[PDB]
């Protein structure tokens, strides 16, 4: 196994991971330019990305240091949502620094040293640019509407965001201080328009067994079950699948019917008007639920039967291991109703009040799953925005603010730490270059002016990639929540600092 010493791994660390920070910063900003997605080894079919996380997920990279970023990318993208393309570049921004610093004789120990303290200096300046908006519900309304769709900006489909973010803020407006994304039932379902993407108050199922089970019911008891029917679960009502004798295989079906039929009983005898099964429902027990006033929905959504268990107050049957014994889902309203082109089974009267079904309606699924990809990262920031209602002034504003802050701190520090810390806030100054140069406008003008603006200090005028020029952050909607920034300010310098301690790399590959 081959030992990579300092510069071998470290250059290999830069070339990939900084370029990994590049094609993603090529996507940084909505005017971060579209990157045609050229996949590695499979799927020649090409999307075109305004968000670099795709590339990271689409294109695999051989650089191990770059293999780290995609995960850190997914750290943001999953945990924090937005900040995904950004966490990758700021590290590369700090890596571009260590390009010199290493060859400039600075040991990566020191390179972490300043960035250890410097990370908070920006955090603290971004704690200073952290100011609570959303301290009022109307604020919170528009504070969501601020950073809700702001999450959707670079992300390829910012257009239906008009209808989407209104949906996205309403469901979280309904959360009312208690973030629940499981009480939001996420259904990406084709049909109708994309502006026909919808938010139900209640639960819902994209699964419809059909109209051969009762469609609408009031005061309905929903059985939440993995209970099988043709599947032959426990508690013999009549012969299940087995051979106990010559003719015992024949005693199966008719008594399996009775078993299916008393697996109506056990299921029905809950008193249900709806039986929602995450597993199969055979047609006779199905239709015998349809004859029992029970709506039996086959193989209903895993997450749905799970959220129906969460939002509606249901318990899973333990896979019929509670033949009569399982607590029901209880939703006073059953609606089999068409959102889009598809009849979907709506459930209201559910246990949770925040319980909602956001129905994302694809006019095409490429935008639909994209709506769902743009949906939750907002909801990620939103639940964050819920818990901490606040903003930070983006578009380079707080960047340059933090830049002028940490640098002037890198000016009052400047021991071994500033060697990193001057290298630190320059990245805070270098990302404002990225979006504006993505915007195709001189940063050296704007940045160095944004510098002056934030060398005067600023919460307001910041580089607006919408305008492509320096402009207000008043909470204009391009003012970012403190939610993602702190996470990126945490997550970004890490992978840099992470590779900073391991230049030594032993490779048996």
């Amino acid at each position: 196994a081959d030992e990579e010493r300092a510069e071998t791994a470290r250059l290999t660390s830069f070339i990939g991971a900084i370029a990994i920070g590049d094609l993603v910063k090529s996507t940084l900003g909505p005017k971060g330019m579209d990157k045609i997605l050229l996949s590695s080894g499979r799927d020649a079919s090409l999307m075109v990305t305004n968000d670099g996380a795709t590339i990271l997920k689409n294109i695999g990279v051989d650089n191990p240091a770059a293999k780290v970023l995609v995960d850190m990318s997914r750290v943001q993208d999953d945990e924090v949502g937005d900040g995904t393309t950004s966490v990758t570049v700021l590290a590369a921004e700090l890596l571009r620094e260590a390009e010199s610093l290493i060859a400039k004789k600075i040991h990566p120990q020191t390179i972490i040293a300043g960035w250890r303290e410097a990370t908070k200096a920006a955090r603290e300046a971004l704690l200073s640019s952290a100011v609570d908006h959303g301290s009022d519900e109307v604020k919170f309304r528009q504070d969501l509407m601020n950073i809700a769709g702001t999450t959707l900006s670079s992300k390829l489909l910012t257009h239906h965001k008009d209808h989407f973010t209104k949906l996205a803020v309403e469901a979280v407006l309904r959360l009312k201080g208690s973030g629940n994304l499981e009480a939001i039932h996420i259904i990406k379902k084709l049909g109708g328009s994309l502006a026909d993407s919808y938010l139900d108050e209640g639960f819902l199922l994209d699964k419809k067994i059909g109209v051969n089970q009762p469609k609408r019911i009031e005061n309905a008891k929903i059985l939440i079950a993995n209970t099988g029917m043709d599947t032959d679960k426990i508690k013999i009502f009549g012969s299940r699948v087995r051979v106990d004798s010559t003719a015992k295989v024949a005693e199966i079906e008719h008594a399996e019917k009775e078993k299916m039929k008393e697996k109506v009983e056990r299921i029905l005898k809950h008193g249900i008007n709806c039986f929602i099964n995450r597993q199969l429902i055979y047609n006779y027990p199905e239709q015998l639920f349809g004859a029992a006033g029970v709506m039996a929905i086959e193989h209903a959504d895993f997450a749905g039967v799970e959220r129906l268990a969460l939002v509606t107050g249901g318990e899973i049957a333990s896979t019929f291991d509670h033949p009569e014994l399982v607590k029901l889902g209880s939703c006073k309203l059953i609606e089999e109703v068409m959102i889009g082109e598809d009849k979907l089974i709506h459930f209201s009267g559910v246990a949770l009040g925040e319980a909602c079904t956001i129905v994302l309606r694809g006019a095409t699924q490429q935008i639909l799953d994209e709506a769902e990809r743009s949906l939750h990262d907002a909801l990620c920031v939103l639940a964050q925005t819920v818990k901490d209602s606040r903003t930070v002034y983006g578009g380079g504003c707080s960047e340059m603010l933090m830049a002028h802050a940490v640098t002037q701190l890198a000016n009052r520090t400047p021991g071994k730490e500033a060697v990193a810390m001057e290298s630190y806030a320059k990245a805070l100054r270098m990302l404002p270059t990225i979006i504006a140069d993505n915007a195709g406008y001189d940063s050296a003008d704007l940045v160095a002016q944004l510098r002056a603006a934030h060398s005067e200090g600023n919460t307001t005028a910041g580089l607006d990639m919408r305008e492509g020029t320096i402009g207000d952050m008043a909470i204009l909607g391009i003012t970012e929540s403190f939610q993602v920034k702190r996470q990126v300010l945490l997550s970004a310098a890490e992978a840099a600092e992470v590779i900073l301690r391991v230049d030594n790399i032993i490779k048996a590959a």
Partner: protein, 517 residues
């Protein structure tokens, strides 16, 4: 056929060795830098602890092969210097080489290294304190078990791991000899918690067999029933389906299980616990019917486990249903059923005071690699006191002791003369290479920070204060709280000065032409 002559073999032994030694010296201290491992599969892992990473490193070259084998015995007793031996074993290496290239025999200075190793040992043995106690060690163990965690996994002190790592030793330290061994306590990695979430257990623990969660989770007595025999009807890793001559015979089959449950519960009840540890995982449809008869059976757990948890109590495993015996059942001071992680089920926690042949610190982590290097932390904090148990002993420095150790060996060179003066020349400096090579991977001149304690060793003797592993501005090996068993440093010397001599073993470097393939 390849034929190397003298230095040629050596020079061929020099190539990767120093290169491998080079990777060690930038790993020295928090000043140092971890060694990432990309596997033969390409698996990218940050690692350390040379024998560990030298086991991950594929050893083709010969001298590196002992670096796995030598550093093995290094990590066991000590826990540190495994990354530090190859430093000196690489540092003392080209010491002899250039001497051999000065015309100096392998016959000549090679003895002098060991001959300087003993006197450096002899010198070391004075430095700081050969003395500790079960109380004193704790603070060295604190500043060990703070930083041992606080180097590898985190940099912060995690106390619940820190002193539980040392007390685990201290729990079995006084079980034998006043000396634990490194198996005589165990570190069990599983992640249900965070890093700080851990279980100090005076016996082994497992995740209990759960054939359904709603069935009651219970634990009783002090004792456990460890079972090769049936606890309830046993199942031998083999399906048993439903065949009954009548539709009534299925419900008649239902009683057979439950009655043989309680019967063999009653047969376990009188003997040990009411609980199983059963070498046979039985039918979980039936097991939760016994979990409906409660008194939870621990089943579907390894055949080595019934062996393990038995011997960990000093007990046995009941081979046959007619062989059921309390001694053939395992034990504990307390068997308790405690939640593994916060949210998950309650693992059966067997805390064994009826004997402890392993006191298992069970550890949780946010991730493997952290709980790994938290484990890999614990092991060293466990290994360092495995020195302490034998002699309660420590020292402060690699940049305090050695520069001082060298300082005796230093002028002792010209006190040698003829053969080993060039040895104790090449020995003493090779000692000071480590603070050099650590000052190397520090932000400082490896010459000047070595010059630092050089002047200091021209001043202070047997220093508790030496250069910075912890990378501070002040260099105080006591107040850097870099703490290494003077056994270990001594043993390290014995082990580090070892390999270089060993490449001289016989006169035969002779190969058929394959010394590596």
């Amino acid at each position: 056929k390849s034929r190397l002559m003298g230095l040629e073999a050596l020079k061929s032994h020099i190539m990767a060795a120093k290169a491998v030694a080079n990777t060690m010296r930038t790993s020295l201290g928090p000043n140092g830098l971890d060694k990432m491992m990309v596997d033969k599969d390409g698996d990218v892992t940050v690692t350390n602890d040379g024998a560990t990473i030298l086991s991950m490193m594929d050893v083709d070259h010969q001298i590196a092969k002992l670096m796995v084998e030598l550093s093995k015995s290094q990590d066991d007793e000590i826990g540190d210097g495994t990354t530090g031996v190859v430093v000196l074993a690489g540092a003392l290496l080209e010491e002899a080489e250039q001497l051999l290239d000065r015309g100096i025999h392998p016959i000549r200075i090679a003895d002098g290294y060991e001959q300087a190793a003993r006197v450096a040992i002899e010198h070391l043995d004075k430095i700081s304190d050969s003395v500790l106690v079960d109380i004193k060690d704790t603070e060295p163990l604190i500043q060990t078990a703070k930083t041992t965690l606080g180097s590898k996994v985190v940099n912060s002190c995690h106390r619940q791991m820190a002193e539980i790592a040392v007390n685990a030793v201290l729990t079995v330290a006084d079980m034998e000899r006043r000396d634990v061994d490194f198996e005589l306590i165990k570190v069990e990695g599983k992640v249900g918690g965070r890093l700080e979430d851990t279980k100090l257990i005076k016996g082994v623990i497992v995740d209990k067999d759960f054939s359904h969660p709603q069935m009651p989770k219970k634990v009783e007595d002090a004792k456990i029933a460890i079972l090769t025999c049936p606890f309830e009807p046993p199942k031998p890793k083999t399906k048993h389906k439903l065949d009954v001559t009548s539709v009534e015979d299925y419900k008649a089959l239902q009683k057979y299980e439950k009655e043989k449950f309680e019967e063999m519960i009653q047969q376990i009840k009188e003997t040990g616990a009411n609980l199983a540890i059963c070498q046979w995982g039985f039918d979980d449809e039936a097991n939760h019917l016994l979990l409906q008869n409660n008194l939870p059976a621990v089943r579907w757990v390894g055949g080595p486990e019934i062996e393990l948890i038995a011997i960990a109590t000093g007990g046995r495993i009941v081979p046959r249903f007619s062989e059921l015996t309390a001694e053939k059942l395992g034990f504990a001071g307390l068997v308790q059923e405690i939640s593994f992680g916060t949210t998950k089920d309650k693992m059966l926690v067997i805390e064994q005071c009826k004997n402890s042949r392993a006191v298992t610190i069970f550890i949780r982590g946010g991730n493997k690699m952290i709980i790994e290097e938290a484990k890999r932390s614990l092991h060293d904090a466990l290994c360092v006191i495995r020195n302490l148990i034998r002699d309660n002993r420590v020292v402060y420095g690699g940049g305090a002791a050695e520069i001082s150790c060298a300082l005796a060996v230093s002028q002792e060179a010209d006190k040698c003369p003829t053969l080993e003066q060039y040895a104790m020349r090449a020995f003493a400096d090779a000692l000071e290479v480590i603070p050099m090579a650590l000052s190397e991977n520090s932000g400082m001149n490896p010459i000047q920070t070595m010059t630092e304690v050089r002047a200091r060793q021209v001043k202070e003797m047997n220093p508790a204060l030496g250069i910075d592993c912890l990378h501070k501005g002040t260099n105080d090996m006591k107040q850097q709280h870099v703490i290494e068993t003077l056994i270990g440093k001594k043993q390290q010397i014995s082990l580090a000065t070892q390999m270089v001599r060993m490449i001289l073993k016989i006169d035969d470097i002779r190969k058929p032409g394959e010394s590596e393939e």
